Amino acid sequence: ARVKRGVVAHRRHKKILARAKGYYGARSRVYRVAFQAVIKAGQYAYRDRRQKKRQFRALWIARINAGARQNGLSYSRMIDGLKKAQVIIDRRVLADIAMHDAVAFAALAEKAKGALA
Amino acid sequence: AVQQNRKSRSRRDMRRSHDALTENALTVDQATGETHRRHHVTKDGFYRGRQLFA
């Protein structure tokens, strides 16, 4: 039962090289280099699934800060005031309202201010 | 004495970006009608109204 390694080996190399399209030089042509390139890409993607949620929350907090400082507060005091008024809108929606609807955001800032005083 | 890394195919084509050829100065001798290299005797021995080796 002599077994030849021609078809399965060729298909494995082919599948690894099909996942390396767009890479530069030997990284999309040479199996040894493309294999390390695909593994490192998977590692990077695993770590950036975690980092994406931090980056987006930082962006929401910055936009809410910009919106609150036009209404007379800092981010800290608006978030504290909204928590003291039992408003539970999260930051993803607050940043949306800051970026698209200035009147409703002024209403929210007034509610927070009233809660603080 | 020798390289430590092979040269990418891009840096090898970047060096050859000065390797192109140019044309020569060719004119029409309407004394005879033919094309010839400017300032040179034609293939059959004509130049500016004279013939060598008739």
Partner: protein, 103 residues
């Protein structure tokens, strides 16, 4: 008409006719669900903010179907330690369409 609703542990800002994906639901494809824990309603310089809920506000939606997102590939590796591991993932979702916002 821009209401704010809760679903699947997250919050959404919706209008009428909008189609959106949320986490998997138990409801049946073709049924009708109703969100009656509404956080804010804006109808144009008329703004109802819930503390934490707007009292008599309704948002109705229809279940179009259930599906899966595209495949994600998880790769764990430890260099120089003889350790590699790989996994696949597709996440489930329910697709809703917003029918009415009461206010």
């Amino acid at each position: 008409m821009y209401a704010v609703i809760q679903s699947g542990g997250k919050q959404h800002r919706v209008v009428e006719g909008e189609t959106l994906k949320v986490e998997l639901l138990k409801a049946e494809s073709g049924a009708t669900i109703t969100f009656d824990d509404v956080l804010m309603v804006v109808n144009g310089d008329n703004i109802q903010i819930g503390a934490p809920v707007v009292a008599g506000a309704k948002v109705t939606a229809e279940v179009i179907g259930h599906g899966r997102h595209d495949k994600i590939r998880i790769i764990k590796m430890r260099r120089r330690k003889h350790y590699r591991k790989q996994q696949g993932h597709r996440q489930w979702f329910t697709e809703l369409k917003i029918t009415g916002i009461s206010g």
